[PDB]
Amino acid sequence: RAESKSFAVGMFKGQLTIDQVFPYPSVLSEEQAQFLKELVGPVARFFEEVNDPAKNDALEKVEDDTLQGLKELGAFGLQVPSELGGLGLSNTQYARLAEIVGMHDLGVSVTLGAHQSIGFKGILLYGTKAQREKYLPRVASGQALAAFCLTEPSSGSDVASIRSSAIPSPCGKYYTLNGSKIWISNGGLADIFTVFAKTPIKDAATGAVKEKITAFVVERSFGGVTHGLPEKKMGIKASNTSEVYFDGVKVPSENVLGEVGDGFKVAVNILNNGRFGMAATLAGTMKSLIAKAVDHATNRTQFGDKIHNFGVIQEKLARMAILQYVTESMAYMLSANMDQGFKDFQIEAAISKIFCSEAAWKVADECIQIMGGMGFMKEPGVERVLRDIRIFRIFEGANDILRLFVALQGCMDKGKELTGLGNALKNPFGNVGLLMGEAGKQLRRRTGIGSGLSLSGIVHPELSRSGELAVQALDQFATVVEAKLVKHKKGIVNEQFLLQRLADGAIDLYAMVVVLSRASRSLSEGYPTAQHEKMLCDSWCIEAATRIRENMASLQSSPQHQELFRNFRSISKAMVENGGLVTGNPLGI
Amino acid sequence: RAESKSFAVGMFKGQLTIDQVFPYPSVLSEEQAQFLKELVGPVARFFEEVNDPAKNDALEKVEDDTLQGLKELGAFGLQVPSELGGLGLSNTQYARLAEIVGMHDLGVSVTLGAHQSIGFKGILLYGTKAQREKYLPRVASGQALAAFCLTEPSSGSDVASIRSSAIPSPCGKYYTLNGSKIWISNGGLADIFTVFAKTPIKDAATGAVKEKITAFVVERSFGGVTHGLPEKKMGIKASNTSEVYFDGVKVPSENVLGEVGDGFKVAVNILNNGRFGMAATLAGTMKSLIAKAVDHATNRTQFGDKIHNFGVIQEKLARMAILQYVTESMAYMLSANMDQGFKDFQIEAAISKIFCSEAAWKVADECIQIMGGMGFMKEPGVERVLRDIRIFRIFEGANDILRLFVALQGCMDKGKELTGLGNALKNPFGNVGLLMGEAGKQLRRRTGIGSGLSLSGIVHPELSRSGELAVQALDQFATVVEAKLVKHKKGIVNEQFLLQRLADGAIDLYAMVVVLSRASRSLSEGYPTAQHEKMLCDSWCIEAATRIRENMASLQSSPQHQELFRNFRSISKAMVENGGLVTGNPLGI
Ligand SMILES: Cc1cc2nc3c(=O)[nH]c(=O)nc-3n(C[C@H](O)[C@H](O)[C@H](O)COP(=O)(O)OP(=O)(O)OC[C@H]3O[C@@H](n4cnc5c(N)ncnc54)[C@H](O)[C@@H]3O)c2cc1C
Ligand SMILES: Cc1cc2nc3c(=O)[nH]c(=O)nc-3n(C[C@H](O)[C@H](O)[C@H](O)COP(=O)(O)OP(=O)(O)OC[C@H]3O[C@@H](n4cnc5c(N)ncnc54)[C@H](O)[C@@H]3O)c2cc1C
């Protein structure tokens, strides 16, 4: 059975599946690129002639007749098959536009994000020809917007808990649908509500019924769909976002999307098929933060000098730069992997969401800090974009959950190979090649040889110094997984403190290797910036190898860290019991 | 000459001047306390019956007739001599009220902060009897507000650059004053503008003139003072904040405050005499964040459970708790040191500002993260208090500057003792006791003895485990200073990258020892929470000893860190040259 092409999955097994990762990918046909040249121009000039971010914020919705203009560029159909009404773009052409719009206004660009990153996305990802023909030409025009109605009060971050749910009619010719969904994008505006809901089914093991989760397409034309007024939120304000209510809505059963009960797989497939766009948009946003910053820090005097001459400004600026270049270099790589058409990349997707969402927030905060008083005002716009970033660590799955998902979904196949232990011990002689070099891991790991991994020939020689770091990290990272997995078995899923820290380890490690790949590309092709990219990549790899070391080491052994986890359980418990901070002030009064 | 009682100054010399720090201080007379008990009640109940934070934000000023009510409690005169119209409070009684108001609305409480933490503060800290009698009874009533008009466009965070400046009249009977000041609190409302400006003086070495900096008191009753409309800012919005302009304002010369040219010392004295209030207010704010947090995390289900049962929630909550308890335990300690009346504590002051301002922001961000979607809305208020915190890392001196100040002002006296080297080598025999145990440092440090430091008897025995950590940290921290100081001499002031990291080291180390002191108090007196405080203190000390290790070690030796600092200088330079992010996207387009 073929090895999972996922680099991260390989990395959990301590294997080195570079092949989704090297050379840093290129995917454009010469027409696909050339087409892109013709699109970049007018769209970006739109976002200086036409748009106005501050006014968009003030109105708490898009400029309606500026929004309209996007319909005419087909902005609501960028990924649709061209003759069915779209631009037919590959993932990576689309991602470039996502970078552009992310440079300018998160609000509009996330209204799109809802509408086309995930909104109708099921119609492409499973819809039949009849489904596409019916709905898609409407949606692509942006005459009809769509929304991904997962979340409801009871619980949103656990899909299995959704109580909003649906009765097949007795003639079977339609499903019937009920429930609230809360915080749905374009809930005021959309026509094509995708809705995810529970439904009974007669089972295929006994003919008893069980309850399973289904995804659906619902036009507001059905009647009985209704939505609240918009909520008030920290930013993104030009985006419409509301509840949606279902008055027993009827749904002709050929509007089952995918197949009844496949819905949960659909939901995770859509969200993973969308996440790359977020990293693209934040890449753009960061590009415009860092520009705004360096310009201010170019002009401001202090202490008789331009402040960019002072070390702490240089460090802040360099970090923000590295974070942008990493995010960009990851986003384009995931889009390219999809356009090539690898099928498995679930971890890389989740990692890209986590890293881009947190890193943009780090950058924007530093930006305000360098910008000082100037920065804090409503005039310079940085303030709005900061407020707008903080949302991204939450929606489209909160990063804490996504961390746990990364770690668990990762160490599925490690668990498989450990099961390979129990199998092989019970066929040592009949089977051949059963464990050849498997204990060799300990031959490598106990006696302190090189593990046998290298980036030789894989990375441009000059980088290989920093490239060496990745091997070190990898050897250390995969090592701890084995131990901490084995000790805890499938009980691991309750070792949350540990799982989180493995999530952060995986994040930094994969972020490392991505940049090291792109750097190798730019070095070899010799673009004039290639030495600059070398300098960035090296700085990142040095820091990331440091953090990974102190994570892995502090996690593997320290009794004091077990004292910490004990303390956190104790202290959290005490806070919960008291329902508050336990201790009075030193005065008692 | 007496040893500086400053613990931090001692710490720079690697000495252990616990005596400003142990036992954890108590300062209240039984009337001072009892008075406080009578004040806590009605004020806090005011901040539930009367105030409304959301409306305050909406109006972008205080509820005018709610503001009025504070005048009647004397809120604008809490520190004024009672018979001159104040409450006569010690620092620590005032600090308790600061904790209360910080629990509820940063806006009002910083309008006070401007008015009385620093505003009139020069009138107490140097004003003559005639000055106090004249101005103070007006100000204490809050009929007249006051402002600390340091900052102006040209430059604000460097006091020496202020161009706003003043001519002594030829009769000498008044000074005459000119310039703008920008971002001045209560600039719309205040009557008693303190203003800080340059002025010529005939020198006392030749009778040639030089230019020096003076502080002044200015009533708007003088005429010729004017101010802009209010600016728009991310929060705190109920605070008024504006420019102020000076139309050649005349100032009768007995309104020199302190003495002409002493102004810069006055400015730093005021700001240091104020900073403790900020740590108090944020302590309160954090107390109400963490309460809001634990309550939401007490009720929310997910995955079939209350989420507080899941490890990552427990860790977040425990950290937020530790950060609150540290901030509180520091603020009250600085206030107590002032009420006792130690004179030198400049570093502890700056540290308290840095740590409280950053730590509250860490807490508020985690609070939003646990609060998820619920958290992001305008309904629960957390979003406003988050926006309101981000300002504190900037104003009253930006933390980056304050870091550099901490490190430099610290290693002044180390430089003195190294000069003691050059002196002693040129009197080895005449002088006695010249260097006895001084090379003993290397006897201790090379051969790896204990340095001779301990907390034995100083800290409660059970803590001494975590107490041991401080000695380790201290030995490591002071060690690097010596080396990095010596190598760089007074050129050190240009080794910014290094100085910053020493600032962070000092921060964590002193924060540790503070909590270890308070914990020892609570243990010995045996308050029912004392085991809880033990658990907090231990967790903090373990983490802080870890971060200090990796700071000191990574800074002292790694060539790769010198490669980093090289890279940052190179990369920052490239960004400045290009005035932007250097590299195109992987597509070139
Ligand atoms: C709501 C609000 C209220 C305010 N109220 C007051 C008030 O009551 N009184 C008052 O005096 N001010 C007030 N201010 C102004 C605020 O305190 C200013 O940030 C500060 O006083 C001066 O900062 P600046 O912007 O002039 O610094 P800048 O000149 O803009 O420089 C600060 C930035 O440059 C960098 N920098 C500058 N010099 C150095 C150096 N030597 N080394 C390294 N980095 C350096 C820092 O990293 C920082 O990012 C207020 C501001 C706001 C937003
Ligand atoms: C502006 C905006 C737009 C939105 N648009 C959409 C949209 O288009 N589509 C959509 O589906 N949703 C949307 N949402 C909702 C958002 O995606 C939700 O945050 C998410 O869908 C579900 O989160 P929740 O609040 O229900 O999670 P909750 O049930 O509130 O739980 C999340 C919190 O609980 C903790 N937690 C939960 N489970 C665990 C666990 N197992 N272990 C440890 N900790 C745990 C986490 O630490 C986190 O802090 C939007 C929200 C906003 C604010």
Author numbering:
A (entry chain B), B (entry chain A): 68 to 656
Provide the publication's sentences verbatim:
Mammalian complex I (NADH:ubiquinone oxidoreductase) is central to cellular metabolism, with key roles in NAD+ homeostasis, respiration, and oxidative phosphorylation. It couples NADH oxidation in the mitochondrial matrix to ubiquinone reduction in the inner membrane, reoxidizing the NAD+ pool to sustain metabolism, and captures the energy from the redox reaction to transfer protons across the inner membrane and create the proton-motive force that drives ATP synthesis. Complex I is a ‘boot-shaped’ enzyme, with a hydrophilic domain in the mitochondrial matrix that contains the cofactors for redox catalysis, and a membrane-bound domain that transports the protons. Here, we use a popular complex I-linked mitochondrial disease model, the ndufs4−/− mouse, to define the structural, biochemical, and functional consequences of the absence of subunit NDUFS4.
The 12% of particles in ndufs4−/− class 1 were found to have an additional large low-resolution density on the heel of the complex. Particle subtraction of this region followed by local refinement with C2 symmetry produced a 4.2-Å resolution map for the additional density, which was visually identified as a dimer of an ACAD-family protein. Mass spectrometry on purified heart ndufs4−/− complex I (prepared without cross-linking) identified two candidates, ACAD9 and ACADVL, both with mass ~65 kDa. Although our complexome analyses of DDM-solubilized ndufs4−/− heart membranes revealed co-migration of ACAD9 and the ~800 kDa QP subcomplex (but not co-migration of ACADVL), our MALDI-TOF and LC/MS analyses both contained substantially more peptides for ACADVL. Considering the sequence similarity between the two proteins, these data suggest ACADVL is present in greater abundance than ACAD9. We thus chose to model the density as a dimer of ACADVL, and a survey of positions where bulky residues (Tyr, Trp, and Phe) vary between the two subsequently confirmed it as the major species. The resolution achieved was sufficient to model the two FAD cofactors in the ACAD dimer, accounting for the ~0.3 FAD per MDa protein observed in the purified complex (two FAD per dimer bound to 12% of particles). The location of ACAD binding in our map is surprising: ACAD proteins are known to be membrane-associated and located in the mitochondrial matrix, but in our structure the ACAD dimer appears to have ‘slipped’ around, into a position that would be occupied by the lipid tails of a membrane bilayer. Therefore, we conclude the ACAD dimer is artefactually bound, and that its observed binding mode is not physiologically relevant or involved in enzyme assembly.
